[PDB]
Design a protein around this ligand. Structure first.
Ligand SMILES: CC(=O)N[C@@H]1[C@@H](O)[C@H](O[C@@H]2O[C@H](CO)[C@H](O)[C@H](O[C@@H]3O[C@H](CO)[C@@H](O[C@@H]4O[C@H](CO)[C@H](O)[C@H](O)[C@H]4O)[C@H](O)[C@H]3NC(C)=O)[C@H]2O)[C@@H](CO)O[C@H]1O
Length: 141
């Protein structure tokens, strides 16, 4: 599938034929230096945002942490927080999401940062959305 180039934020877009084992999604952009304190990459089913299989949510708050979570039928589940901020405000980033059968792995700037085990079946998620304090250069597959 062709990449989305300079998509405006907030973004959503379709992942052609859905998430698959071994699919790698790159999100390349810049964290804004002073336009808020959080951003999110969401892997979801459709365009509603009520069923987000994997919400990856860096927060430049309390010194900085990343929330990983799942929204199901409009309900957020138990957060998995990573008390490690691998981003810097104002700086470019390259995020890579590797879909595996049991989990997502998230590489930040080349290096595995977090592992999130599937809470809902992944082959059904077909949409990426991005919101918050970021500018995007591209999303590639
Ligand atoms: C200590 C503790 O338990 N803390 C809890 C808080 O962390 C918690 O905050 C919520 O946490 C969830 C993850 O658990 C999300 O980060 C929530 O933020 C919301 O995220 C959604 C999805 O990204 C976002 O909606 C999207 O917005 C875009 C455009 O911007 C568009 O409208 C899409 O349609 C939509 O999906 C939403 O805006 C965002 N809201 C905020 C305020 O960030 C986060 O609130 C709270 C509440 O559960 O509970 C604490 O106790």
């Amino acid at each position: 599938q062709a990449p989305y180039l300079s998509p405006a934020v907030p973004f959503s877009g379709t992942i052609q034929g859905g998430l698959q084992d071994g699919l790698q999604i790159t999100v390349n952009g810049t964290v804004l230096s002073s336009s808020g304190t959080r951003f999110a990459v969401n892997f979801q089913t459709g365009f509603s945002g009520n069923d987000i299989a994997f919400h990856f949510n860096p927060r430049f708050e309390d010194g900085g942490y990343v929330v990983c979570n799942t929204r199901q039928n409009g309900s957020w589940g138990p957060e998995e927080r990573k008390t490690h901020m691998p981003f810097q405000k104002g700086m470019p980033f390259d995020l890579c999401f590797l879909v595996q059968s049991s989990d997502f792995k998230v590489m930040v700037n080349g290096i595995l940062f977090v592992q999130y085990f599937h809470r809902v079946p992944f082959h059904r998620v077909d949409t990426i959305s991005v919101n918050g304090s970021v500018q995007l250069s591209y999303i590639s597959f």
